[PDB]
Amino acid sequence: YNKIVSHLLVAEPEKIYAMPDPTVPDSDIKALTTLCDLADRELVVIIGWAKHIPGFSTLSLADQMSLLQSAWMEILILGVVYRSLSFEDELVYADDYIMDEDQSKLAGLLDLNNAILQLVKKYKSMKLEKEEFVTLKAIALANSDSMHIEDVEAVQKLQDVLHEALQDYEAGQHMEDPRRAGKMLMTLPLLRQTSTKAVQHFYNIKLEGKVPMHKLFLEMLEAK
Amino acid sequence: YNKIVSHLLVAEPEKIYAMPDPTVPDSDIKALTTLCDLADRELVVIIGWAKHIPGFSTLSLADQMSLLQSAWMEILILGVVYRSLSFEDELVYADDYIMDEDQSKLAGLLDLNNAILQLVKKYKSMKLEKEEFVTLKAIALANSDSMHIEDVEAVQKLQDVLHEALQDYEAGQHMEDPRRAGKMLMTLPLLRQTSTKAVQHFYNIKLEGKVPMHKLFLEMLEAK
Numbered sequence: 001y002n003k004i005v006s007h008l009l010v011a012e013p014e015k016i017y018a019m020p021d022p023t024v025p026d027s028d029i030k031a032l033t034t035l036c037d038l039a040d041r042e043l044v045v046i047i048g049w050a051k052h053i054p055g056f057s058t059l060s061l062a063d064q065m066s067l068l069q070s071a072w073m074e075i076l077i078l079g080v081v082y083r084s085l086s087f088e089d090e091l092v093y094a095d096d097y098i099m100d101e102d103q104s105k106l107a108g109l110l111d112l113n114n115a116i117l118q119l120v121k122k123y124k125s126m127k128l129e130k131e132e133f134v135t136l137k138a139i140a141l142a143n144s145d146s147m148h149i150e151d152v153e154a155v156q157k158l159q160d161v162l163h164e165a166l167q168d169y170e171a172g173q174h175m176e177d178p179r180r181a182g183k184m185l186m187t188l189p190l191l192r193q194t195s196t197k198a199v200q201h202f203y204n205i206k207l208e209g210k211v212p213m214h215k216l217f218l219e220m221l222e223a224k
Numbered sequence: 225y226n227k228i229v230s231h232l233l234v235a236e237p238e239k240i241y242a243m244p245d246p247t248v249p250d251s252d253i254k255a256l257t258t259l260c261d262l263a264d265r266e267l268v269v270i271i272g273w274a275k276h277i278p279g280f281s282t283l284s285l286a287d288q289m290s291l292l293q294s295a296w297m298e299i300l301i302l303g304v305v306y307r308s309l310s311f312e313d314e315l316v317y318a319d320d321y322i323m324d325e326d327q328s329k330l331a332g333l334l335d336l337n338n339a340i341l342q343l344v345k346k347y348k349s350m351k352l353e354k355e356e357f358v359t360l361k362a363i364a365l366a367n368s369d370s371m372h373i374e375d376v377e378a379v380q381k382l383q384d385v386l387h388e389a390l391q392d393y394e395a396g397q398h399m400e401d402p403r404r405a406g407k408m409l410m411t412l413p414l415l416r417q418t419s420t421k422a423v424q425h426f427y428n429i430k431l432e433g434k435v436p437m438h439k440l441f442l443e444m445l446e447a448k
């Protein structure tokens with residue numbers, strides 16, 4: 001099938017472990033510290049992953065950073081969603097960090113994780129494929145609606161290149177549903193809504209100062 | 225062209241006047257009171273408008289209310305956006321209520337109205353048509369991602385019926401861009417983001433208790 005889709009598949013990062021500290025008593029602070037540490041390490045590999053997207057590295061460094069600063073949490077959440085598709089009412093943040101309802105309550109994340117489970121529910125019914133997941137991650141990056149873009153036309157071109165890949169993939173692989181590509185695009189509003197909820201929640205955790213956060217995570221959290 | 229699109233065009237409500245009180249001194253409270261009063265009256269006609277959407281009135285009353293309670297601010301904002309397309313850095317809330325940057329600052333709405341102007345900017349470059357505007361309003365209603373839906377499959381069917389209308393319209397009217405329907409769908413994340421910003425802002429105005437609000441507006445603002 002589509003070459004961009006195949007390329008994004010081989011660019012997919014390896015799995016990352018959460019490694020919650022086994023000497024630390026379980027608590028909301030422990031769970032939040034674990035999740036923010038995991039996100040920081042995922043962000044490093046997301047930056048390297050974006051360089052494989054056709055045309056992304058030819059944008060200015062400022063535009064690359066603007067797209068990443070608007071899309072980072074959407075990309076993180078799409079990953080948790082995809083890893084959770086074969087599970088029931090549980091979120092696979094990592095193979096060693098699967099959160100059920102009790103753990104979400106203990107971490108103060110019941111509302112956020114329920115929103116992520118709503119994304120999981122919809123993608124389960126659509127039978128989301130890995131090919132579609134990686135293409136939607138790239139589209140979410142290109143379509144992230146930063147207020148600070150310098151080269152608006154180049155970013156629109158990147159959007160068009162990735163949208164074309166999704167449409168070509170669906171036309172060849174899903175002839176039984178001529179509207180499947182658009183159904184995939186119609187899942188992006190809930191992803192944007194859930195990501196905004198997560199950014200706001202963890203910005204407030206940052207303000208309270210009880211959960212340590214690393215530099216790259218803090219950089220994304222403090223972006224305008 | 226497409227019959228659903230033609231039907232939505234003839235169902236389009238008449239213009240509504242803001243009628244700011246000419247005896248009241250200008251202030252943030254006056255501007256916010258005017259906008260919330262306008263929104264309340266627009267909501268009444270939005271409820272009547274939704275009954276013309278094929279299949280909407282056959283949903284349960286609870287599902288109709290769930291969709292409206294999730295989408296109401298998206299529908300309101302799409303209207304302001306469309307009315308503003310021929311203007312520059314101004315928002316046409318009504319023919320008698322056009323807000324420029326100074327007025328937005330005075331009302332405490334600079335950040336919200338700048339986000340709405342970002343929607344305007346993108347639709348200007350795409351040359352958004354009235355046919356596309358009314359279809360996107362209906363899609364935003366059907367695709368509003370309420371947590372409380374009873375008949376998930378019927379709501380998905382409504383989404384599919386309206387998505388098909390958009391795709392059929394674009395296939396017939398815009399053969400020069402075979403991806404235009406998907407470009408239209410890719411504007412929905414920013415609409416969802418901007419609507420959430422507006423709901424949160426006016427929920428906080430409600431809490432502060434200095435701006436009177438009418439029953440229907442308050443009902444939507446207080447929905448879960």
Ligand SMILES: CC(C)c1ccc(O)cc1
Nearest residue numbers: 035038039076077080198
């Ligand atoms: C910041 C939290 C919500 C988070 C951490 C890792 C991840 O893959 C997705 C989300």
Ligand SMILES: CC(C)c1ccc(O)cc1
Nearest residue numbers: 259262263300301304422
């Ligand atoms: C509630 C405010 C933001 C508002 C009022 C009327 C309208 O058409 C769109 C928005």
